[PDB]
Design a protein around this ligand. Structure first.
Ligand SMILES: *[C@@H]1O[C@H](CO)[C@@H](O)[C@H](O)[C@H]1NC(C)=O
Ligand SMILES: *[C@@H]1O[C@H](CO)[C@@H](O)[C@H](O)[C@H]1NC(C)=O
Lengths: 92, 199, 92, 199
């Protein structure tokens, strides 16, 4: 249920302060988590039920990031985006 | 409507290969966060890697794109990050620089190639053959990242030059000009760049 | 706001299948996250606002785990708990 | 109400030092997930590390605790993971094993220490002095993880022994028994273990 998903966007769609016409493929992690598989989450879930414990469980998040993305803004200056986009996803 | 040079940048960012190596040269070549000084050698190294690892289709779009206005030409001129890869305090004499290039295998190999492939078809016919266009473009692009890194020098033409002038030529003045004009006024090179952006 | 917290529990309180009288200190990560600091979350938050994107942001989670915990059950068998407890926490 | 040996296990798990090294020996010594065979040498190695790195306060509670019922004695007996650290197919002759211990520096050093510190005060007075209790407990605990690893042998006493018998002693029978009874029937060692769990 925790999957990678890709969308084709303008760099301005990211809202990071840039005034450009350059573009990218942005990738992200979506979905819900298994609720188990670590000992830690088994304990969080169990402690919650017997109420001897809202903050706890895992999240579908990036485990790898894409390559740096470069672009020339409208004012003839280059910029580099680092770890802007995800390569793989896991529940962590 | 936009740009052909901007059209090229989108194609490069949407291609996993081109995008990777573009960023790999921008990194060591770009300043402008402070003014500072780049590592010319890392920049040159990254630049050579860009044109050798990325297919001509994507790597030429960036460099040989056609332009309709002066803004487009400025984008095209910033391709190689000239503040870092190109300009220096002063310009040396061109023949001096030619000598310096011939002492570096990489540059010597590339300059020879340029002079071989980017010359007239015959003894009167100014332009080279059309099926020789690709190999001339390969040779000019190949000079980028050497001490003989060239770039476009104005807004109203496809004239290019390295960072050298012909001051202090003496009796060698005509040969220096002959060398510099082989970049500035190359009929085959202009025509190859004109044919790439068909029209 | 993302902090470590420690509680003294029975091993049976963890509900991991064991029948013992042995004990532990269980540690966990609690709180909400800053909502920024990575480029990735800045983009998630921005894409959400302009609605060009519920799954997204970071979580206060364990970044380091405690030492293994051993115990003898009531049936005279030993067991070892691995990565059951957290040592440090970050938003990831 | 519980146990003193269980009381000890809680104190050890709630102490960062004791907990770490407890788990570091249980790991290589414990099977019972399958029956399998442990790595005796890693187990012994982990065991020596446990008693050398963890203070007596926590490391003795585990081993010298007092017991009220047979269940408590069973816990106390599993302290060292005897299925791995202790028992083998057969028991060798004790004098044979004594010889084997004297060829290993570590064991030779430890056996000497046991025999030095866990002996009668004088020539008639069975028990050793009380201020010598600690150093006797240090010597017995120190044997654990050597080829002379000892353990408690029943439910109704603090009698201990290594994994050896006196079968095939011949004319050396009395000396073999004298060696084995230095573990099994040590007045100073019983009294030191009785004083630790005061009462
Ligand atoms: C990106 O930018 C242009 C701006 O002119 C916009 O009109 C267009 O819809 C966008 N294209 C995308 C996201 O593909
Ligand atoms: C743990 O276990 C005992 C079981 O007798 C229980 O009564 C006690 O409340 C618990 N103690 C804790 C969590 O400190």
């Amino acid at each position: 249920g925790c999957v990678l998903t890709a969308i084709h966007l303008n760099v301005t769609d990211l809202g990071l302060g840039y005034e450009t016409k350059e573009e990218l493929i942005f990738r992200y992690c979506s979905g819900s988590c298994d609720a188990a598989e670590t000992t830690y989450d088994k304990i969080l879930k169990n402690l919650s039920r017997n109420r001897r414990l809202k903050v706890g469980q895992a999240c579908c998040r990036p485990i790898a990031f894409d390559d740096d993305l470069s672009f020339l803004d409208d004012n003839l200056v280059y910029h580099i985006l680092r770890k802007h986009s995800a390569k793989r996803c896991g529940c962590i | 409507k936009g740009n052909n040079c901007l059209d090229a940048a989108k194609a490069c960012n949407l291609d996993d290969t081109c995008k990777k190596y573009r960023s790999a040269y921008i990194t060591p070549c770009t300043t402008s966060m402070s003014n500072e000084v780049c590592n010319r050698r890392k920049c040159h190294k990254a630049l050579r890697q860009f044109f050798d690892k990325v297919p001509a289709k994507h790597s030429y779009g960036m460099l040989f794109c056609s332009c309709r206005d002066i803004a487009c030409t400025e984008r095209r001129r910033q391709t190689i990050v000239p503040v870092c890869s190109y300009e220096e305090r002063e310009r040396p004499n061109c023949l001096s620089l030619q000598d310096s290039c011939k002492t570096n295998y990489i540059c010597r190999s590339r300059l020879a190639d340029f002079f071989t492939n980017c010359q007239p078809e015959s003894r009167s016919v100014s332009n080279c053959l059309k099926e020789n266009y690709a190999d001339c473009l390969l040779a000019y692009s190949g000079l980028i990242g050497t001490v003989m890194t060239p770039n476009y020098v104005d807004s109203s033409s496809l004239s290019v030059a390295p960072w050298c002038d012909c001051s202090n030529s003496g009796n060698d003045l005509e040969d220096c000009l002959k060398f510099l004009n082989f970049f500035k006024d190359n009929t085959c090179l202009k025509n190859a760049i004109q044919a790439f952006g068909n029209g």
